[PDB]
Design a protein around this nucleic acid. Sequence first.
RNA 1: UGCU
RNA 2: AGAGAAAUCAA
Lengths: 621, 388, 656
Amino acid sequence: TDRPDHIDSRVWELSETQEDWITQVHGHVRRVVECWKYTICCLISNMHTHRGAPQYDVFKWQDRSTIEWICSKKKVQYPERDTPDLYDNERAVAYKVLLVSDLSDHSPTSGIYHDLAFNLEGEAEESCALVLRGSQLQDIKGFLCRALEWVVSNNLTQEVVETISGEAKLQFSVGTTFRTLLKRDTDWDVIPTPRVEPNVPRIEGRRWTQMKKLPLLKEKEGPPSPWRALLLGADSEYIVCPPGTDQEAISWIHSQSEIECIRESKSTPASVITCLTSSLQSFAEGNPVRSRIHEDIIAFGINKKQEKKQSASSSASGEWKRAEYQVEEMSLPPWVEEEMVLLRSDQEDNWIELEKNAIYTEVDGVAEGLVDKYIEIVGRTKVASVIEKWQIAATRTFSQLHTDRSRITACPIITRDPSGNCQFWGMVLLGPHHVKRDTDNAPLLIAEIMGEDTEEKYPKHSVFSLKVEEKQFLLSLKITSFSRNKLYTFSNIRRVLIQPASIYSQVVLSRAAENNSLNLEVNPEIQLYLEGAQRGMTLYQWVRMILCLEFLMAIYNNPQMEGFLANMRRLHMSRHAMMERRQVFLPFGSRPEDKVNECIINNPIVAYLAKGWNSMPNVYY
Amino acid sequence: ECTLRALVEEYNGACKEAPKEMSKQFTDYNTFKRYTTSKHAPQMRLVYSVRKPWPISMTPSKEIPLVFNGTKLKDTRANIVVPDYWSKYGSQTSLEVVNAILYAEDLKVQRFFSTEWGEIRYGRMLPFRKPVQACPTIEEVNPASIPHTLLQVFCPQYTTLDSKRKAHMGAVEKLKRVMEPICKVQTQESAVHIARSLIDSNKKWLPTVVDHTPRTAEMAHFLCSKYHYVHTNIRSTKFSILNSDHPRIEVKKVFSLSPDVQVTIPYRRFKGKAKVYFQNDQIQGYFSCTDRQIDEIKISAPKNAPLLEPLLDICYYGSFIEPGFEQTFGFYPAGKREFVDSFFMHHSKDHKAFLIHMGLDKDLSLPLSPELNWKEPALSKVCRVTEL
Amino acid sequence: MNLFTPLSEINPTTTQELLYAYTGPAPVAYGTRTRAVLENIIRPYQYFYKEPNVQRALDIKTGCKEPEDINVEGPSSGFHTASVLKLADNFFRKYRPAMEKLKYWILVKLPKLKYAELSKGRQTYSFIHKRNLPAPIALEETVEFLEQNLRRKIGPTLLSYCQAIADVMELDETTYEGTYTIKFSREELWDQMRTLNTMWKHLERGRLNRRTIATPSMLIRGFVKIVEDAAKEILENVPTSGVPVGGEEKLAKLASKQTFHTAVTGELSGDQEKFNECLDPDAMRLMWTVFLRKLGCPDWIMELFNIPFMVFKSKLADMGEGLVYTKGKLTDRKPLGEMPSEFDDLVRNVVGNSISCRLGMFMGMYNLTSTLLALISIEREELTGSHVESSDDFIHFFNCKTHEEMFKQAETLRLTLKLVGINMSPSKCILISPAGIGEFNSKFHHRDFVGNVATELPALVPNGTNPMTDLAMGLNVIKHSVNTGQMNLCTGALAMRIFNHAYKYAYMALGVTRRTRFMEENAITPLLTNQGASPVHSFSTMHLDEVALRRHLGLLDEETLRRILNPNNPVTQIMEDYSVPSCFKYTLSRHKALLNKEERYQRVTSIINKLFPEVLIQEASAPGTVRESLKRRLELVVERSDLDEERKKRILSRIF
RNA sequence: UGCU
RNA sequence: AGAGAAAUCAA
């Protein structure tokens, strides 16, 4: 695939990127034919001028924009696929060169442009010979003679006449060396052709078994699961403060505070109260950044990686073996129901203040009324306050966890009531975080207000007595490392309101659709399988419990929870089917409860949902 | 014009600075246009970015750095408050500029506040999603000629005759009228985006309880749902027979891709002799008809007018040209619709069949040209066509 | 869970979305991926035989097996060749109209495919830098490598790209000169072409155990793209495909259709167990060969449709970083075969830091053509039901007249998918006999109602472009969620309110911060949503822009309207068809040898963008190079100008 | 250093 | 310490 001697380097370089030569049949020959035609056009238009402008304007292998510009000035327009090769300005005609094997079959292609016929040996058709000058014919005959001697030197004459007869043939050929590489790891060729007669064998399979009864999940036995979450959830109280900014409230709390330890946990040493008090003071002055102190190495895990590596390498006793990780199995904690009841408790404020969207149509009024009533239902609840606390804490922690600071940062958890009083829900304490990925864990020191102390529920939280203005509240303190993605997704924890809103909306809309009337204060009876018996609560209480359960499911989301829910969707569908007096059949090795039981290890709400499943009628008959 | 000087200077700078990249092929533009090492989403780094001391990256201009202890310029970088300062105590523009800067949005808002919504009713109606045109368009344009229409609107001089042929006329003129101010005020890319959004027919799956008109489909997320529904308020040419010896037949041809599957696509043709007066906008005239051939055509058209689509309308009327009514297009037609469209696309891309059917004459007195244009100079003219 | 199963006024399937984990962190994968990929590679060999015989199983080139060797109890890896021939023949004779579309695509659309579309993909492993790179960089590196080695200029079409890839493998020695003189041999280039770069599938929900994915190298991406567009063209026209192009309307029609009362209905909905570690590429090669041979396609088409799978039969999966080994409390990662482990049968198939695997597919590749292999098995005389399958998820509607025939067809359906290795999951497939209650993809079906249930919650969080555009994307996402049936009136309005509140917060328009106090003593009245003003968008008004709505409602008046839409403003100067350029349409403020190339290509793109208005509308297509194209366009625009001849000629003189 |  | 879950973060 090299340049022919009779073709100039400029012509070859121009012709390189004009068409896909490599993927066409008889490549490197069609390109040579096109180069022949272009060279013929150039020789015909060789330094010839007329009326002060070149007589012949070649169009082959030229930009379409400038071709259209030239044609527009000449009061003629040409199509893309049938454009002439050159135009004769002297007599206002267009000519396209066409190499042919025989000159007898002139065959005028079209009336748009007269053609020019040339054979492979040099002689031209009578029309194109008598329309052009003798020097042009002599030059073309010489060029064709050199082309023909080149062709017969490399004996492509049949190939040349095939390209002349044809127009284009797409192809794609795989070489012989690539074929050997391709067929190294297969029993067939590039074109498979097994010597087997097509047929579908008759295989004897097993039989399908009916799900006579719904499966029973396997409750796990072990120590009760502690409360493993960023914040305290339902046990979260707040301290009222005079109206003002965060700094004023923090200064007031620091001025009026007496901290004494009630319960000390080995996980969180009681000595980390000094750094928290220092952070209170520093935020009171105004700068929520402090230099590192002595009581911070055991508080934010400074140099723990190197220390633990040295401790592990100190012994270095044993033999290399595959790393086996064991996940401890835990039972259902007693406090899940306590949290569910407390999260449903009624508060005084609304705790859900969202700006009402505008109303322009009748449909907008219905949606806004439904949203307002839903917010009224689930607003004056403890769970809404806990959601607001979680949102504020996560956002304040995330906003200060974007740089690579090596100093302690303070992010108080302060909310403001409609009156204006500050509300101290707790405080997040950033540590030195040289974060590099969203999955990296940044040290935190969560200090928050309890409402009740339970050692079994909080084995790691240290409880300190806090006295503020003749009122005493507890104070939690836990060391926690928490990642960027988790903080980001908890900064939008208000999204959890959607699912109970969807349930309430569908109930109300179904009630309004049974008849033809919108009521907006429908409170139907929702029959549920509570404690085995079929007792039904109200819609308002059901949505309230649904929100609390979803909030617990959100802050306690993990791969176990995801697998549990994903594999129990089908069991819920089967339960609905059996409720509708329907038969459920299963294949041979069908153990749907196995896919669920493997996801129940130590997650509290997973175990609670498992018990709720195993608190239901088994056979629906 | 200094713009040409700037273009030349920038081209020289690009050639000198980036020799290897400039030596790439022009078709590689579709590859290196999106060349970037940027790798989720910046939604995470927004609350911190907005609260940075100098979030706004402004250009050197006449902005007060300190107003009422503002500190809004560091010299560039700007404070987050300077977008708000440009809403009061700033510089204003002409009413034509503000009217033309947004046009499609004004149309969408105007349509919304122009419909008399009925009374919302609730029931057990179940919606089924169907593909309907997303938003109303200024003209009915197929999803294949939109790029060519845009090329004709924005760059008429950089185009090809084929692109003009496969472009919806009429919509181009209205688009030019509505976008002459918009192109002047906004950027070229934004202008192209507004133009396509005006003319694009993007079929999008939407809820459907009743047949959605293009107007209704735009606002459908609230009109219908699972529990409620509120109730709202040949091509262009025509033909007329004058003298038909026998009436038009309804013969149909069946295509057998396999012995088990067949399709029945009927083609309508005359018999004997006929004369039909075809009318299409400025084009008017009557042509003699044969059993399947054409004897004479009389056309009254404006000078230098495109006369391709009217003749394609004529060919379909009598099933005159063979390769689109008996001989398939190389593939089995699934239905009559795409057969109707594919005929008018294949025979508009190339019109060799018409020229072969009617033939070519060597004289220049015949008005119509092989390129299907009225009264233009040419090296040859199609025969058996005259004027009234 | 007793709260999620109501007994009155609402169906349990209606409360199915409560069984989701929209809020809360999604699971993320930690540490090395070697263990996961090794357990993914062992499965095709463990299930090949009825009893585990991996040591002998590591000698099979083609997964063809005998009917008596198919494990009817547990998973079975492999296929039956004659079964594949007969099933492909049946799937071609039936649905024949859908096969002429493939013929039209091959004869017309296939040669017109451009290799520039390969840049609109995922991150690609580059055999130059041995590092994951964005698709455009990998594509341009591969193109430059081919041009340097083949000594020719690659055509714009994808077929030319594949021809160049085929030709470069014929050269014994290859180089990538360009400071750098990286040298490759035929074997090294072949291994780089075969190598798949494996990575964790991060942020995946609904699974307890993490799983890995791999992406093809640029040397085979063109072939894979060709076969995948062919598979898509076939799947877009068959009623048995759960392709998103069909919109899952097929499930809606199958749910709404009636049935003769005496006929016994039934609906099987389930998952496929180990879908991507049971299928053998040779089955797809054979099916494609049958499809293109019964269509009368040319021989070169049939050849071209087998490189993508024959390279995959020789895949060299990247193990990763190694397996974790511990002495005491210290952890060290070691490569496979360095120490005894639970994978010692595969130490032979180790090529550096890669593992070879003839049998089995891998996640992240051949998604569309896997569906075709799962749909040819349906076309049998016994099976008279309606199948809708999308990757490892199917649904079958039985319409028998007797229960015994129902179970016979159910077992026939179970067995026919095992003839090619689909291996439906026994523990995940559930059949409901009386009528239709089931799930497909994320949809849930009950009687005549099929409702979409989201897998991941719509992110009601502001983006990072600018408030004017950010509101547009937020409202568009909410509108899309409502339009798919996942949301409704109240849920949609609540989502809008939550998004609006977060959007106001994220631009310092809420509470008492620097911005709002800056607007206090300066008398800057808030007129936009991002300024903390009252919201203007309603539930029925997600599809209109903010500024036009406020102008129509008389909120931005005209003095402020003129000032905020000034084109000469200092700040400025699911497609987003909103956010007219205004004052608030601003932008924020944010191996090294690739950066300079980035500015070089940016300059080339900028100069092209100005002289070529047509590249904004249609893809660039013009013979020649960038330099010549720009030079000729500059000459044309100079001559097209209205200036006199002397100015034009001196401008052309300045061009150099 | 101020999202109910 | 702790976070956590089949293995990493605590530079």
